[PDB]
Structures are given as C-alpha cells and as structure tokens.
Structure 1
Amino acid sequence: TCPFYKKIPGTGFTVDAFQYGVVEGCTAYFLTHFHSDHYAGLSKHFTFPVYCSEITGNLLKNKLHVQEQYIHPLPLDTECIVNGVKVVLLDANHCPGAVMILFYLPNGTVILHTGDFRADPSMERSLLADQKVHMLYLDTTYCSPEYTFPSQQEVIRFAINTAFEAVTLNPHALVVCGTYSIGKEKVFLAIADVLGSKVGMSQEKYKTLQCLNIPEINSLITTDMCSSLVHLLPMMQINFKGLQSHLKKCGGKYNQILAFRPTGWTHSNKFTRIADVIPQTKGNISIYGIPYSEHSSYLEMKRFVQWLKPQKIIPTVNVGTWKSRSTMEKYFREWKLEAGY
C-alpha cells in the first residue's frame, strides 16, 4: 500500500511510488531521480505515464528498458501542463537529473516536493523566489544539529591535493574511487583531471555515465583500464582484501593504491575537520573516507525552510519511528518561532 506522503492531494499524482503495484486513482507517476529506493518497481513492463527530467528519462530507457512511449521528459525551469495541472521541475542539487517538483493545484494551493536535495542559497533565486508555498514535502535525511559537513568544494580540494601529492611522489601509484549509484561524479572526475588521466570503469558503469549529458564526457571516461590511472570500482570492493585483489590484476604496472570512499555523514564529522582527515593504511594500500554529501546539512535545511516559510511540512525521510517523527516536529516548530511565520 502506497503511503500518504507519496500522494499529492487534489491531483491524480504520486511521487516516487513504483513499488506498490497499480495505485488506485493514479493517472501520472512522477520520478524525482534515478536512485533505487525511489525507482524500485519500474521495468520494460510498466505501462503508465512517467514524468521526470531528460536525464532521468535517458536512464529509464537505457538502464531499465522502459518503453519510450511511456516516458515523458520535461524541461527544467519551465511551466508545463500535466493532466490539467500546472507543474515546474527545478534542479535539486542532488545527483544528475534530480529534480524538485512544484504543483499548482486547481484550488490555489501550491505544493513543493523537494525529492532528495542539498539545499543551497541559489534556490532562493529560482522560480520559487516570490512563490507562496502552502505545503512542503521535505527531504529530512539529516534533520538534526549533529549533522554537519563541509562544502562540496572543500571536499574536492582535499581529494585533488591528496591524489596529486601521492602520485607525484610515486608515479607507480594507482588511484581508486568507489561508487554504487549515480551521484558524486565530481570526486573521480576532478582527480582524473589533476592527474591528466581518463577514468577507467566497467562497461555497465560507462553506459550509465553516457546517459547523463555531462559536457565533453567522451574526453574524461573510458572502458580501457590499461590506459587509465584512476579506476572506479563498486563501493563494496573498497576494502583491504578487495583492493589487494584488484592490484594483482593490474599486471605489475602499480605498486601502491590510494583509494577514496565518498560517504555521506559519519560520526568522525563530530570530531574532525576536513583538513585533518587521515586514511586507514595496511602495507601499500591507504583508504580515505571523505564526507561528500548530496543531502542538506541541518543548517542548510533550516535556512531553506525559514526562507520559504511553508504553512505545513510533511517529512519524507526518517518517518518510520515515533522518536524521529517527534524530533523533526520539534525542530520545525523551533524554526517557525525563531523566524516569525
């Protein structure tokens, strides 16, 4: 059964609701982004209209084999009419193709669904600018003040400088970056760029990246592993055993591995600054966990909501426990009282 927080009232619409069979009364299914918790259920056999961004539509067609006749891509920042209701897609600052959705209900109510997002001040100058929003369906992933992390720019600076130092000291070092979904591409692209290398990867991962409309991508990625000194592997292989195994396969080209795991928040954010981060090392392998987030920090989320001043907030993450729900509700009230809405 489809949960209430995936339904848009006064419409025939659901958001990220593909794992519940045929949802009674749903005339159009929206998909915010191509992450598996959100697309779970879509396949070549899906025969209802799916509304999404162009990038998301490319991934549906080529990775899930959804038939073209049911994929309805919409341009960003453009008023569109869907089944008699005005909608707008906005960039979510999450992974490639991820959007927020504005719904203008026939009765005058305005609803913003953030999908997954990393709130940014730049959103305060989109089409949201002087738009009254009555209901906000909010990505509350990190809705607690302990969740701090650096800017994406600071984390990339650390990664570039770390990789460049290591490989300039040892030209026979290989760099490895973990991945398990789309998103966080800047990590491996920025490192390859500083090293003057293409990024080497599996055919399956290459296929995925070719769907993302990234400028000059043919110049940056390859399936020829032998030509590359930056390799991408599944996140599950980024451990001492898995990396030792990989090094064996490279045929004595390399004698050291520097590897990166781009996590979200971890407990070491409560203690350490990005400049001070150190790896776990065993012999000729080192592994850095770097806090590259594609979700709002607590402070970023707070600033967005206090700027927007919604009348009602509906959380879409951490909704399964009474303790989480009570904690989030207490922060929303704090934010409202501080800002005066």
Structure 2
Amino acid sequence: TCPFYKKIPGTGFTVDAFQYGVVEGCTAYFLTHFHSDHYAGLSKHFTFPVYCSEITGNLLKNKLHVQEQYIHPLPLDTECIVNGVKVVLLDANHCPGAVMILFYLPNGTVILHTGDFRADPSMERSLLADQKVHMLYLDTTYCSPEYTFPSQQEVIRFAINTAFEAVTLNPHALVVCGTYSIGKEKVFLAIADVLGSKVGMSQEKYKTLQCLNIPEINSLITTDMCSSLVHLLPMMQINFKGLQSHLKKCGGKYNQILAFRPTGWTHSNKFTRIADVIPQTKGNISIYGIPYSEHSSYLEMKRFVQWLKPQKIIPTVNVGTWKSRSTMEKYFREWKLEAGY
C-alpha cells in the first residue's frame, strides 16, 4: 500500500508511486525522473495517465514501452492545469529529465516535492522565489554532516586531467567508464571531448542516450566500438576481471586500461581530498572511484531549506528506520532555530 509521503493531500495525485497497483483515489501519477527506484512498477501494461518531463516521456515510450496515450509530458518553468490544479515542473539538477514539482492547492496551500535533486543556489532564482511554500517533500539522501563531496566541476576537472595525462603518455591506453542508469553523462562526455573521440557503447545504451535531448549528441556517441577510445560498460563489469576480459575483445588495439567508477558518496570523503585520490591497480589496469554526486551534499541541502523556510518538511529518503527519522528531525529543528523561521 502506498505510503503517505508519496501522496499529495487535497488532490488525486501521487508522486513516484507505480509499484502499489491501483492507488485508491489517484487520478494522475507523477514521475519525477527515470530511475528504477522511482519508476518501479511501470511497464507497457500501465493504463493510467502519467505526468512527467519530455525526456522522462521519451524514455517511458522507448525503453519501458508505455503506450503513448498515457504519457503526458509537460514543459518546465510553465504554469499548467492538471485535473483542475495548477502545477509547475522545475529542473531538479539530478539526471536528465529530472524535475521538482510545485503544486498550488485549491485551498491556497503551496507544496514543493523535490523528487531527487542536487540543491543549488540557482534554484533561489527560479519560480520558487515568487511565493511561499508551506510543505516540502525533500530528498534527504545525504542529510547528515559527514556527507561532504566536491562540486561536479572539480570532479570533472580531475577526470579530464587524469585521462588526458594517461593517454598522452600512452596512446595505446583505453579509457572505460562504468554506467547503470541515466545521470552522470558529463563524466564520459568530458573525457571523450578532451581525447578527441566519440564515446562507444552498446546498442541498448546508445538508445537510452538518444532519448535525452542532448545537443549535438550524434557528434558525441557511437555504437562502433572500434573507432572509439572511450568505451562505456555496465558498472558491474568495472573490476579487474571484467576489464581484462574487455581488453581481450579489443584485438591488440590497446595494452592498458584506465577506468572510472562514478559512485555516490564514499567514507574516503571524510579524509581524502579529490586532488589526492589514487586508483586501484593490477598490472596494466587502473580503476578510479570518483565522487560525482547528483544529490545534495548536507551543506547544499541545509542552505536550500534555510532559504525556502518551509512550514513543514516531509522526508522521502531514509524513512525506514526510527534512528534515521529521528536524526533528520533534529537537523530540521537546528536549521529552523538557526535561521529564525
């Protein structure tokens, strides 16, 4: 049965609630973005209206085969009426197509559901600045102060310079980047760009990237592995076994692999700086884990909430334990007392 934090009171709306069968009273199912924990339950046999971004809609049609008549894409930054309720989709600074949703309730309550997001000061000059928000359904993934990580810009700088250096030393080195869902495309596109190559990948992954409205994408990616010196592989294949087996398949074109594993946060973040990160190495294979996050750090989350000053906060992540729930409520109270709302 659908949990309360996926229901929008005063509406027939749910968010990211596709795995509970038919939700009693729900006239429209919103999908924030195309990640499996969020879309879980959707398939080509789903027969209720889905509201989402254009990019999320392209992926529902082409990857899950949801029929077109049930896909309702909405433009961003635009006031739209859905079943008699005004809504706005805003960019969530998560993966492609990911949105936050503002719901303007008939009784005058305003609700922001962040979906999955990485809070940014630029959101303080979106349509959010224009009115008050009473309830906030918040992505609390990293809501604890030990969760620090660098900016996306710094991480990409590290990766570009690492890759460029390795391949200029050895023109016979192959770069491999791990992937399992959309998001974090910047990692492999920046590296390929600095090396003057397209990114090579499977037909299934190429299809996925073709849904994302990335400008000039046809110039950046290919299914011809032979012509490319940046390859994508499934994340599970980024280990010494998987990589050796992949190097065998390239037919003596390369004698070295440098591989990147974009992770979320990892405990090495409490000690080590990004400058200082080193790979794991076995023979002619090196593997960097890099902390490229598409979720708020603690400090980014704190800033956004203190700026927004919501009257009530409802967490959407880490809700399954009493210890987590209790930890989160403590930080919300701190933030509220520090800022005076």
Q: Same fold (TM over 0.5)?
A: yes
The SS at the match of 2:88 is strand
How far the C-alpha of 1:123 sits from its partner, in A, is 0.1
Question: Partners of 1:23 and 1:69 in 2: how far apart?
Answer: 20
Looking at structure 2, the residues matched to 49 and 248 of structure 1 have their Cα atoms a distance apart, in angstroms, of 47
- Partners of 2:240 and 2:26 in 1: CA distance: 48
> Cα deviation per residue 1:187-218 (whole Å; 9 max; x = unaligned)?
00000000000000000000000000000000
Cα deviations across residues 43-66 of structure 1 (Å, max 9, x unaligned)?
111110000000000000000001
SS at match of 2:176: strand
- 2:188 is matched with which residue? 188
**Local SS of the residue matching 1:242:** helix
Q: CA deviation at 1:228?
A: 0.3
Distance 2:131 2:79 in 1: 13
Q: Count residues with an aligned counterpart.
A: 341
Query: 1:160 Cα deviation (Å)?
Result: 0.1
Query: Which sits farther off after the overlay, 39-48 or 151-160?
Result: 39-48
Alpha-carbon separation, structure 2, partners of 1:326 and 1:43: 36
Q: How do residues 203-218 of structure 1 correspond to structure 2 at under 5 angstroms?
A: 203-218=203-218
Deviations for 1:249-300, whole angstroms, at most 9, x for unmatched residues?
0000000000000001001000000000000000000000000000000000
Q: Deviations over 1:119-168 (max 9, x none)?
A: 00000000001320000000000000000000000000000000000000
1:227 equivalenced with 2:238 (yes/no): no
Matched, 1:32 2:65: no
Q: 5+ residue gaps in structure 1?
A: none
Q: Deviations over 1:215-248 (max 9, x none)?
A: 0000000000000000000000000000000000
Q: How far is the alpha carbon of 1:184 from its aligned partner?
A: 0.1
Q: Which residue of 1 aligns with 2:97?
A: 97
- Report the secondary structure of 2:187's partner residue: helix
CA RMSD for the aligned pairs? 0.3
Say which SS state the counterpart of residue 233 (structure 1) adopts.
strand
- 2:128 is paired with a residue whose SS is coil
Q: Distance in 2 between matches of 1:323 and 1:42?
A: 31
Q: Quick one: distance in 2 between partners of 1:39 and 1:339? A: 36
Separation in 2, partners of 1:131, 1:227 = 52
Distance 1:170 1:303 in 2: 44
Q: Sequence identity of aligned pairs in percent?
A: 100
Q: CA deviation at 1:322?
A: 0.3
User: What TM-score, normalized by structure 2, do the two folds share?
Assistant: 1.00
| 2:175 partner SS | strand
- Point out 4+ residue stretches in structure 1 off by more than 3 angstroms: none
Looking at structure 2, the residues matched to 27 and 74 of structure 1 have their Cα atoms a distance apart, in angstroms, of: 17
When normalised by structure 1's length, the TM-score is 1.00
2:268 partner SS: helix
Other structure's SS at 2:158 match: helix
Unaligned 5+ segments in structure 2 are none
SS in 2 for 1:299: helix
1:23 CA drift (Å): 0.3
SS at match of 1:302: helix
Which residue number corresponds to residue 259 of structure 1? Answer: 259
Alpha-carbon distance in 2 for matches of 1:143, 1:110 = 23
1:143 alignment counterpart: 143
Q: Deviations over 1:59-85 (max 9, x none)?
A: 000000011111000000000000000
Distance in 2 between residues matched to 1:293 and 1:86, nearest whole Å: 32
